[PDB]
Amino acid sequence: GKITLYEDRGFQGRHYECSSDHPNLQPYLSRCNSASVDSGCWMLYEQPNYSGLQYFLRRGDYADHQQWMGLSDSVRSCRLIPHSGSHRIRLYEREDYRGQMIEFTEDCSCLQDRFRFNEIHSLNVLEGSWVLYELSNYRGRQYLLMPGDYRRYQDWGATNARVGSLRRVID
């Protein structure tokens, strides 16, 4: 994978090139207002060491931070998400994998149209990486999910159990 981050809009300003995870961009970029993804699925993080607001980027060109749904021009770490050959996620009504349960292998622009709950209280990522979104149509806060058990919403770094849409990390 390969991404180029720019301090300014329209691929202008001081830039830096990443080919792997960087936990600390601070010495290199003071801000980030545009990015070009040559290859790979990337998660950008507001704070260093893969914390704070998260943003999913794919192959493509982002001329301003609003095109990756960025609330600000703050990018201080970035993650190259591993390839997954396949994708499967179970979502549960209640914590500790209890209550109603639905299993997705494909993207969902509106969870409430298939699973009539505004909140997901646990989920099991059986295959591949996913991005959860707070709102429908891939909007609101983003949360990267690696294969794993997630017994409560805190386990995927959210401050609430609200979930409106989710998408496979695929290029």
Numbering used by the authors: 1 to 171
What did the published study say regarding this structure?
Human gamma-D crystallin (HGD) is a soluble, monomeric protein expressed in the eye lens during fetal development. The high expression levels contribute to the refractive index within the lens which focuses visible light upon the retina. However, this halts further expression of HGD. This means HGD must remain correctly folded and soluble for the entire human lifespan in order to maintain visual acuity.
After aging, DTT adduct formation is observed at 100% occupancy at C41 and C108 and oxidation at C110 to sulfenic acid. Although the fresh structure shows no significant binding of DTT, after aging of the crystals, DTT is seen to form disulfide bonds to two of the surface cysteine residues, C41 and C108 with strongly ordered density. In addition to these covalent modifications, the protein conformation is subtly different, with an overall r.m.s.d. of 0.23 Å for chain A and 0.21 Å for chain X. However, this is dwarfed by the 0.67 Å r.m.s.d. between chains A and X in the aged structure and 0.62 Å in the fresh structure. Aging of chain X leads to a contraction in both domains, and a notable reduction in the distance between the two. To control for the possibility of radiation damage-induced loss of DTT in the fresh structure, a series of 20 consecutive 5 ms exposures of each aged crystal was carried out (burst series) to accumulate a DWD of 0.31 MGy.
